[PDB]
Amino acid sequence: SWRKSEVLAVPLQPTLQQEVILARMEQILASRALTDDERAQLLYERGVLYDSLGLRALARNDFSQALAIRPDMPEVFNYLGIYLTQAGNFDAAYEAFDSVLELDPTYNYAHLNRGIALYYGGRDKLAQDDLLAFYQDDPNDPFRSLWLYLAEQKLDEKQAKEVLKQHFEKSDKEQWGWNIVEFYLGNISEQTLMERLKADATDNTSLAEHLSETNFYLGKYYLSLGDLDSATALFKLAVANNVHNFVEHRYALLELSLLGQD
Amino acid sequence: KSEVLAVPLQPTLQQEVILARMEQILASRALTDDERAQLLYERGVLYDSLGLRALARNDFSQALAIRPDMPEVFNYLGIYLTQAGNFDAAYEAFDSVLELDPTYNYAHLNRGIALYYGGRDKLAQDDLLAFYQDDPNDPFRSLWLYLAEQKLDEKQAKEVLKQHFEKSDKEQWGWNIVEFYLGNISEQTLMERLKADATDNTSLAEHLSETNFYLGKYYLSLGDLDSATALFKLAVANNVHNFVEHRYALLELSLLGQD
């Protein structure tokens, strides 16, 4: 009923170019004219594309095949750890991100992703160490502050908001996601946030991507207030955008999976 | 509040396992032309069901090149032509379907829909009446016939819908939507019945996909573009890629966006 009043995108669809590329990849992979390094590479690329299309099992199959050809692929263990997190296997996810960082200690995203895994794994203090490390590599990225806030808020919400406020204040305030931060701080209404979101989006994909991020963070906000019905609706609304490779899409599905259990 | 939404449908592990296996079989020289054609068709159907309609059309076209007597393939190719807005070419594809196989009934539904979208409502009504006649208890056949008749004569279209409802067993869930069309119940009541009838996330998504399309068409026919647009997006958000209502919610949204 209320759903007709929401800010909504057309759920994202595969593009023709993406489909053309997958068709060509099938043909090249089928041919006998690739060296192992060229194969491992192409399998990784196809895996990234399939993940981006929401086909995470086909992505996993490709990543794993590439890894068996070329073991030195932090990029693959990264995806594998994300998928373990999405599956609720946090212990194994930690071991995957540990492998990422042993192969390549500069592969940053493993801190983000291991942090998220630790968060969902109930290890808030350790999550903060990884998410702080990630934040430090780019303090202007509002999503890094949002994740650090999430990891501090169960323990000390008051302090979490003080920290988030400090992060917002230090930042250049340029990237759109700081709006989500201002909503979390109580500076703006949800109406103001949604207005700002529609105003910023200029086509369907930018709209879908804002709604995927924003509805996930609104979902977590309501969830942490104990409003399960709003949280649920908001996670569903996030996923409806079909931004398959966003962290917020992944963990919106995860949060829905957790609400479905209880 | 959350119960009027489904979790958007996702590929299942089995669907992805089947695709991976299909790739390796197609890469082999183990297939006769007839086996290859069939496997290509099957992959195409799966691709289609996952929303990967260009990969599907690739498989379908290749299958047809190997085995030209495939009404099944022309039917999908017709559907894609309708989705793409190429209604004349769509009519020709469905013509080929029916010339290869006059009993390929769904071609009449699909050509009907294509004629509707192509603005040929009287021609669309011949195909949709014929499709109706083949299964009068299928509410969706009455809904599409109604949609086609209502632009020409709304009073008459309603009176035929009313007779179709009356004559039907009124069992299938789609008759609820017909009841809303007929003015018997409120939209809220429809959505309450939908929630009560769905059993799990996939049937909820499938109901929401159908229902939101027909609600969107109702609003669109009243000139309420905003409600329509929301409803069509809400239909698509279910990810029921292979439903008529999904395909044409997407088409309607492309027509609305073109404006």
UniProtKB/Swiss-Prot annotation, chain B:
Disulfide bonds: none
Main location: membrane
InterPro entries recorded: Lipoprotein_NlpI (IPR023605), TPR-like_helical_dom_sf (IPR011990), TPR_rpt (IPR019734), Ycf3 (IPR050498)
Keywords from the named record: Cell cycle, Cell division, Cell membrane, Lipoprotein, Membrane, Palmitate, Repeat, Signal, TPR repeat
Designated name of the protein: Lipoprotein NlpI
Membrane protein topology class: Lipid-anchor
One of the protein's GO biological processes: cell division
Any single GO CC term annotated in Swiss-Prot or TrEMBL for this entry: plasma membrane
Induction statement: By high pressure at 500 MPa for 1 minute.
A Pfam entry, by short name: TPR_16
Function noted in UniProt: May be involved in cell division. May play a role in bacterial septation or regulation of cell wall degradation during cell division.
TPR repeat spans: 37-70, 71-104, 209-242
Protein's cellular compartments: Cell membrane
Subunit structure: Homodimer.
